[PDB]
Write a protein that binds this ligand. Sequence first.
Ligand SMILES: [Mg+2]
Ligand SMILES: [Mg+2]
Ligand SMILES: [Mg+2]
Ligand SMILES: [Mg+2]
Ligand SMILES: [Mg+2]
Ligand SMILES: [Mg+2]
Ligand SMILES: [Mg+2]
Ligand SMILES: [Mg+2]
Ligand SMILES: [Mg+2]
Ligand SMILES: [Mg+2]
Ligand SMILES: [Mg+2]
Ligand SMILES: [Mg+2]
Ligand SMILES: [Mg+2]
Ligand SMILES: [Mg+2]
Ligand SMILES: [Mg+2]
Ligand SMILES: [Mg+2]
Ligand SMILES: [Mg+2]
Ligand SMILES: [Mg+2]
Ligand SMILES: [Mg+2]
Ligand SMILES: [Mg+2]
Ligand SMILES: [Mg+2]
Ligand SMILES: [Mg+2]
Ligand SMILES: [Mg+2]
Ligand SMILES: [Mg+2]
Ligand SMILES: [Mg+2]
Ligand SMILES: [Mg+2]
Ligand SMILES: [Mg+2]
Ligand SMILES: [Mg+2]
Ligand SMILES: [Mg+2]
Ligand SMILES: [Mg+2]
Ligand SMILES: [Mg+2]
Ligand SMILES: [Mg+2]
Ligand SMILES: [Mg+2]
Ligand SMILES: [Mg+2]
Ligand SMILES: [Mg+2]
Ligand SMILES: [Mg+2]
Ligand SMILES: [Mg+2]
Ligand SMILES: [Mg+2]
Ligand SMILES: [Mg+2]
Ligand SMILES: [Mg+2]
Ligand SMILES: [Mg+2]
Ligand SMILES: [Mg+2]
Ligand SMILES: [Mg+2]
Ligand SMILES: [Mg+2]
Ligand SMILES: [Mg+2]
Ligand SMILES: [Mg+2]
Ligand SMILES: [Mg+2]
Ligand SMILES: [Mg+2]
Ligand SMILES: [Mg+2]
Ligand SMILES: [Mg+2]
Ligand SMILES: [Mg+2]
Ligand SMILES: [Mg+2]
Ligand SMILES: [Mg+2]
Ligand SMILES: [Mg+2]
Ligand SMILES: [Mg+2]
Ligand SMILES: [Mg+2]
Ligand SMILES: [Mg+2]
Ligand SMILES: [Mg+2]
Ligand SMILES: [Mg+2]
Ligand SMILES: [Mg+2]
Ligand SMILES: [Mg+2]
Ligand SMILES: [Mg+2]
Ligand SMILES: [Mg+2]
Ligand SMILES: [Mg+2]
Ligand SMILES: [Mg+2]
Ligand SMILES: [Mg+2]
Ligand SMILES: [Mg+2]
Lengths: 100, 88, 68, 275, 114
Amino acid sequence: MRRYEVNIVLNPNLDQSQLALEKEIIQRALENYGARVEKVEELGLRRLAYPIAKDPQGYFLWYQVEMPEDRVNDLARELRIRDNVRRVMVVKSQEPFLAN
Amino acid sequence: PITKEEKQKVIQEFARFPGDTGSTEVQVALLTLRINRLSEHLKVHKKDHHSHRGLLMMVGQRRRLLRYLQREDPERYRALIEKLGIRG
Amino acid sequence: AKVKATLGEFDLRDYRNVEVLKRFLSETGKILPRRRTGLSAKEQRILAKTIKRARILGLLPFTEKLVR
Amino acid sequence: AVKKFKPYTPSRRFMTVADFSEITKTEPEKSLVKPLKKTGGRNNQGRITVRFRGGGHKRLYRIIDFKRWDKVGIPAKVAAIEYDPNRSARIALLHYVDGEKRYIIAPDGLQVGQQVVAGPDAPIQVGNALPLRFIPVGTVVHAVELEPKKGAKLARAAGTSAQIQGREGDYVILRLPSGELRKVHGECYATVGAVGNADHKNIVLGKAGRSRWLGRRPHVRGAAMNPVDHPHGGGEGRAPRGRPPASPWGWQTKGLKTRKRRKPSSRFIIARRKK
Amino acid sequence: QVASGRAYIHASYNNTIVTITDPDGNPITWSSGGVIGYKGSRKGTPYAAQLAALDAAKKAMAYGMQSVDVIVRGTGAGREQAIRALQASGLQVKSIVDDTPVPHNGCRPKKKFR
RNA sequence: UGGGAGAGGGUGGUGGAAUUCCCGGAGUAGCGGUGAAAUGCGCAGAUACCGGGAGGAACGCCGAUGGCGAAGGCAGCCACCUGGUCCACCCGUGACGCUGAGGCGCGAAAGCGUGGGGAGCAAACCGGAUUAGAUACCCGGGUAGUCCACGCCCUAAACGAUGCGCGCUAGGUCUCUGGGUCUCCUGGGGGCCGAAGCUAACGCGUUAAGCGCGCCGCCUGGGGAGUACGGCCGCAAGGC
Ligand SMILES: [Mg+2]
Ligand SMILES: [Mg+2]
Ligand SMILES: [Mg+2]
Ligand SMILES: [Mg+2]
Ligand SMILES: [Mg+2]
Ligand SMILES: [Mg+2]
Ligand SMILES: [Mg+2]
Ligand SMILES: [Mg+2]
Ligand SMILES: [Mg+2]
Ligand SMILES: [Mg+2]
Ligand SMILES: [Mg+2]
Ligand SMILES: [Mg+2]
Ligand SMILES: [Mg+2]
Ligand SMILES: [Mg+2]
Ligand SMILES: [Mg+2]
Ligand SMILES: [Mg+2]
Ligand SMILES: [Mg+2]
Ligand SMILES: [Mg+2]
Ligand SMILES: [Mg+2]
Ligand SMILES: [Mg+2]
Ligand SMILES: [Mg+2]
Ligand SMILES: [Mg+2]
Ligand SMILES: [Mg+2]
Ligand SMILES: [Mg+2]
Ligand SMILES: [Mg+2]
Ligand SMILES: [Mg+2]
Ligand SMILES: [Mg+2]
Ligand SMILES: [Mg+2]
Ligand SMILES: [Mg+2]
Ligand SMILES: [Mg+2]
Ligand SMILES: [Mg+2]
Ligand SMILES: [Mg+2]
Ligand SMILES: [Mg+2]
Ligand SMILES: [Mg+2]
Ligand SMILES: [Mg+2]
Ligand SMILES: [Mg+2]
Ligand SMILES: [Mg+2]
Ligand SMILES: [Mg+2]
Ligand SMILES: [Mg+2]
Ligand SMILES: [Mg+2]
Ligand SMILES: [Mg+2]
Ligand SMILES: [Mg+2]
Ligand SMILES: [Mg+2]
Ligand SMILES: [Mg+2]
Ligand SMILES: [Mg+2]
Ligand SMILES: [Mg+2]
Ligand SMILES: [Mg+2]
Ligand SMILES: [Mg+2]
Ligand SMILES: [Mg+2]
Ligand SMILES: [Mg+2]
Ligand SMILES: [Mg+2]
Ligand SMILES: [Mg+2]
Ligand SMILES: [Mg+2]
Ligand SMILES: [Mg+2]
Ligand SMILES: [Mg+2]
Ligand SMILES: [Mg+2]
Ligand SMILES: [Mg+2]
Ligand SMILES: [Mg+2]
Ligand SMILES: [Mg+2]
Ligand SMILES: [Mg+2]
Ligand SMILES: [Mg+2]
Ligand SMILES: [Mg+2]
Ligand SMILES: [Mg+2]
Ligand SMILES: [Mg+2]
Ligand SMILES: [Mg+2]
Ligand SMILES: [Mg+2]
Ligand SMILES: [Mg+2]
């Protein structure tokens, strides 16, 4: 097991119930791939720096998780399988590096 | 990778006295463990020639240690290489 | 005026900190140099990578145009 | 991984044969084979209408499931990967948990023991059939229906694949094995992944007799014939074509396009092929 | 007809082409160092770019064009002269923005540019 | 044992800029190009502008006088797998070391084979100019190739033109990266300037080209010639 921060960005122009069906898919995906979800920070719609898929906004999910190191690629790829999942970034979690 | 737990089993199953961490046996054993993990990794990643240099350096290192233990103890040499299934 | 001064204590890896990180990009979207950033050698590499990530997550621009 | 031979005959020199590594069962499912009528290129009139055919190895035809919307939602187990002399792809025997058994053409990377399923809700997984409108854009796909419920017409030979490029209304945009870009209805089924046995094009027949085994009788050059036979016939000694290169029947055979202009599918061919 | 629009200055070391668009970027009219009888090296001079800009605005203002946001591309010597000309034409130059294409180290340049 | 830095390597994925092309819009008399031109392209609607699409390659800023690697070489970003290396504690083994003819493996670019891919670029090639000529430089085109996979080739100004290891002989200064008690002290790299000394001089100078020891490789006037013959390797080119 290792700790990863799974970033996901969704389709903003979705009702919260389509948005619910997508999170449930994600949920079952993290579930069936071995992740144990610690924290979960869901910032929602957010103004984009540049247009993504013709959309200046996205719905930003974030999951601190703990999964077997040898399946995070397959999981991440599986998150991308959906068309409303416009971005996914799984990162290795690190203790912070600070200034001041 | 090798984790601290598997690495200690190797030291445990090869220490001479349950505190020893640097004898020829525990070194040959520790190298043999790096090699096979690497030797297998190279069998999949055939173009990782840089890591292969690492493989040769550990092989030479173990061979020099095995050359030393055969001088000081042909009996314990033979005992070590069999427990690691090494000769070829 | 350097950015490490113009900001209190921050985490050089929170790639989600747009308010902290955007302060490290010129008016034209480029990663500022240490002569503007004020970070050290080792700090500058960390900042840029986490800037680079936030660009991929759409949190920071890769480039903005120049206004007069 | 095509196999070579040491040069212990003239022909063994260059001959190559498939490795058949992935084949797991070597006699066909008796319930799914019927006799394949060798034509020799002859039609119902008895006439040769395709020259240089015949005399090849006897074959049983394996019935292949080109629909698969036949059995929506019914999971199936890949039980065997078999040889099939009637196509370039290998074939896979599916034991549907239904108890029903069917052959599909075998996609690359398909593993005996895995499960496949057909339907709108099938996971985007190699071997699964879905209507085109539900496969993600960018996905590589094969055994594609050309028209809804008419059956898999596209990307069926060893190695081929169509790629899903975009959607427009009821239609999807496919890059066919030829590189042609074409509109195909979203209801048309396709199976995720490329056809397997992609090494099939690297086989070297190696001797004349191997073409005979395949039913391919020897081709005779027009230039080798006489003028009653062929445009290129005749001449004292050898002879260049001496006219635009023609078929036996007179039509030009270097670049002369032959697709019909007013064909209805033109409204669906986006861009002609490549290379 | 439209009142406000955008003014685009494509300007290389060869020429300076001004096209005035509408708010939607659809061109209202255009001009360049060729629309004023210069052919050749002269098409790339500052004066050429001035007349090109003046012929651009005088053609667009003749469509009711009053306000332009000035988008500037290239680096040719007729660049600054074009912006100056647009503020002197009579147009309500509401902006100047440099949108020169710059790759993030992409396609290999011609030998002339390596 | 516990830590740290890193474009070290391999695999899968993935982001934005940009160019080319296609489509739709809108729009008109040119564009492009050079020293100046022409070729080219453009009323068959180009260029310039917007929107959409495809595909390829390369990763701007960070970025450095930087880092890593044995060398060649390595630069978006993410994960996986893997190497080397450095530091601390001074815990374990007890000289187990150094080098290294052969051997083996690695080895820029180009080139070669079988597939694939092909946006840009561009040997060849064509055209335009220049010129006495111009099989060049400059311009417009342009096929290999550049890219991927696998297999070959094994070359180089493969350079620090400086083999490897150890020990010893002032410091000043800048920097990367560890440790400390964090002024500063100490390691390990990267440069600079310089003591003694070396050097034909230029220069070198704790990153020796100084003082020593070990081992290896190599030189013995220029041309002929890295050619011939032989032999080995290679598909060939050609290498040794
Ligand atoms: Mg998606
Ligand atoms: Mg963090
Ligand atoms: Mg053979
Ligand atoms: Mg033989
Ligand atoms: Mg042989
Ligand atoms: Mg097979
Ligand atoms: Mg029967
Ligand atoms: Mg029949
Ligand atoms: Mg009949
Ligand atoms: Mg009859
Ligand atoms: Mg009859
Ligand atoms: Mg026929
Ligand atoms: Mg026939
Ligand atoms: Mg067939
Ligand atoms: Mg078959
Ligand atoms: Mg159709
Ligand atoms: Mg073929
Ligand atoms: Mg046959
Ligand atoms: Mg034939
Ligand atoms: Mg013939
Ligand atoms: Mg004859
Ligand atoms: Mg007859
Ligand atoms: Mg006749
Ligand atoms: Mg005739
Ligand atoms: Mg004839
Ligand atoms: Mg004849
Ligand atoms: Mg004849
Ligand atoms: Mg003759
Ligand atoms: Mg004859
Ligand atoms: Mg001829
Ligand atoms: Mg003739
Ligand atoms: Mg003819
Ligand atoms: Mg076609
Ligand atoms: Mg000009
Ligand atoms: Mg450690
Ligand atoms: Mg158009
Ligand atoms: Mg013309
Ligand atoms: Mg007209
Ligand atoms: Mg014209
Ligand atoms: Mg393409
Ligand atoms: Mg001690
Ligand atoms: Mg002792
Ligand atoms: Mg090489
Ligand atoms: Mg090469
Ligand atoms: Mg090639
Ligand atoms: Mg070109
Ligand atoms: Mg000419
Ligand atoms: Mg010429
Ligand atoms: Mg002449
Ligand atoms: Mg040229
Ligand atoms: Mg080409
Ligand atoms: Mg290769
Ligand atoms: Mg150099
Ligand atoms: Mg040399
Ligand atoms: Mg040496
Ligand atoms: Mg170094
Ligand atoms: Mg130092
Ligand atoms: Mg002196
Ligand atoms: Mg001396
Ligand atoms: Mg002197
Ligand atoms: Mg001097
Ligand atoms: Mg010096
Ligand atoms: Mg010093
Ligand atoms: Mg000589
Ligand atoms: Mg020779
Ligand atoms: Mg040579
Ligand atoms: Mg010879």
